[PDB]
Amino acid sequence: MKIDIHSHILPKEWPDLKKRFGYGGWVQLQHHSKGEAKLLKDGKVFAVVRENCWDPEVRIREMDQKGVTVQALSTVPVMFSYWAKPEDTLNLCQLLNNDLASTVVSYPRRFVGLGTLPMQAPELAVKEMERCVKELGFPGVQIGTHVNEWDLNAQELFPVYAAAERLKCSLFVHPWDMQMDGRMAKYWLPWLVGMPAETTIAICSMIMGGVFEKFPKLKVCFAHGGGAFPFTVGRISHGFSMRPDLCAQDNPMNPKKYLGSFYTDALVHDPLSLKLLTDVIGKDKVILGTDYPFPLGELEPGKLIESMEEFDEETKNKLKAGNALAFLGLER
Amino acid sequence: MKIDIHSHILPKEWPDLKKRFGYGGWVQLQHHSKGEAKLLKDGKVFAVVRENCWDPEVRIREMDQKGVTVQALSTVPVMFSYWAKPEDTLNLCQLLNNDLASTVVSYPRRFVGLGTLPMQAPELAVKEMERCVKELGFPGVQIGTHVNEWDLNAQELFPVYAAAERLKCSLFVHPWDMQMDGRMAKYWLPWLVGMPAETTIAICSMIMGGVFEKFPKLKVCFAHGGGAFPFTVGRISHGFSMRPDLCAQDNPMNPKKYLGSFYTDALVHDPLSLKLLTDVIGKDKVILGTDYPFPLGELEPGKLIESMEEFDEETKNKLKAGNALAFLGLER
Ligand SMILES: [Zn+2]
Ligand SMILES: [Zn+2]
């Protein structure tokens, strides 16, 4: 019900990428029947999306109706494409970022853009970041919770962080590329459980990798209330204290010292979790985020926030829009 | 500082297992410096152990300083050995279970036994369970969060649950067998993050698999506060509503509705976490547990509970002792 930091969109169409690049494993969007499109990844329909996933005029009507003022638009994490050749992911990121830039310029009072990067190639990612910031005007980018066998602690990724820091370019971290098969194939576990564990790992990798210590001005927001982190910080903090040989090897400060140093969205569904999220992360560091237009997201944006009896107005306004603005470096 | 539901022990010595069974991957206790030893992978040294890990007099003295009345003894989860040939695994169980019984006989007012079981072979597991309850007098058993490739929903396991429920045998589910390599090899992650993830999966697999609905007298306690579950129940439940096709094919009730139907231990380290845990799981369904003798556990049994200015003495006593007695169907 003011700013939604967490929302995904696709271009309506893009060229056959297998043809474009020479190898398969990409996703396309097919428009078969009305107000619906199939996402495929070699072979199968991966997911069905409705027109709010591509048509910004539809997004505006839904936003008007829900009282959402601005959505920060980012691609669908399936498009990250960190597994492809570096130049080809770059080519794709340019197409998705421009398309994103084009939607934003059409409604620059209702949308901001969070771009995508070829993270598997930190020199290309820096360049594409500069362009997103300087040429495209995006306040930030969305990145995966990991990049192939790299976690957010990886040294290779360090230039990317120094660039983001320097460019005043915010990072929205989104869990992606969990295990989808084996034990994880049933009960939508990769989404229910594997996503919040991915995020929990990412936060851990960034704290214990020293990322926040190297780059104290890096602005970073994690997805879904930081996964399990706000609840298991005790275990993480105490275990860090207990086994510095395994945990304090790169950054000697206890994880608990970085509570306050990063943001999460507020997408945790119940009041008790939200209250704990703010207690643990702080009321300046939690941002309304919705996962629009996906069904695992908040159906009525901001409704969980508005219903918290304990929060005064100032707090509610922080969580709905204020914190978003600090995290993006923009003005109301 | 009355009862500890989560405490692990090993016999002081056991046969060489590479011999007795005739293939590797087992675990052995090697002592070196009088009241100090090391556990071994067959491959290499994983974990340094103190005297308290095998010596019942040593445990009692510490229980006396720390104000612990009773410990529920279970084996070290690395002993589960669900990956091995069944009959072999059974052998190891009877050996570990008789040791456990033999230690309880020495201090019947200070220890109870929680058995292990050849879970990868259901009917053999069943009979060993009847033996643990009828002949050894155990009030329950400890089993892992999954069995090789079966998660706790597997129908193969339903005979074990009916049997457990028949016999009034409580189950303590412990996370084990997380991912140990790849991305998970740094920063003590399989412990700090993989374990809570394992447990969250087990809660989901039992709720969604039909286990609590098909066996309404099964008494089940989860390790470490139930992992992420008390914090992410919101996500897991909203998701279940949004995709009953993906999540409800085996049991149709919303996971939300099984809050109350199971216990967790209180081992969450932080007070905010412990308050959340009781707000979600229930004041009657949280049991003090320490993970004694391991460094990742609570060093002062029940100090966290005692520090909760918001719990009255009735509630402090539920968490310390009254919930464990109820879970195990024992009297004072
Ligand atoms: Zn999302
Ligand atoms: Zn344990």
UniProtKB/Swiss-Prot annotation, chains A, B:
Its EC number is 4.1.1.45. Keywords: Decarboxylase, Lyase, Metal-binding, Zinc. Disulfide bonds: none annotated. Substrate binds at residue 47. Zn(2+) binds at residues 6, 8, 174, 291. Pathway: Secondary metabolite metabolism; quinolate metabolism. It comes from the Eukaryota. InterPro entries: ACMSD, Amidohydro-rel, Metal_Hydrolase. GO terms for biological process: L-tryptophan catabolic process; negative regulation of quinolinate biosynthetic process; picolinic acid biosynthetic process; regulation of 'de novo' NAD biosynthetic process from L-tryptophan; secondary metabolic process. SUPFAM superfamilies: Metallo-dependent hydrolases. Coiled coil: none annotated. One of its GO terms (cellular component) is cytosol. The keyword Magnesium does not apply. It catalyses: 2-amino-3-carboxymuconate 6-semialdehyde + H(+) = 2-aminomuconate 6-semialdehyde + CO2. Monomer. This is 2-amino-3-carboxymuconate-6-semialdehyde decarboxylase.
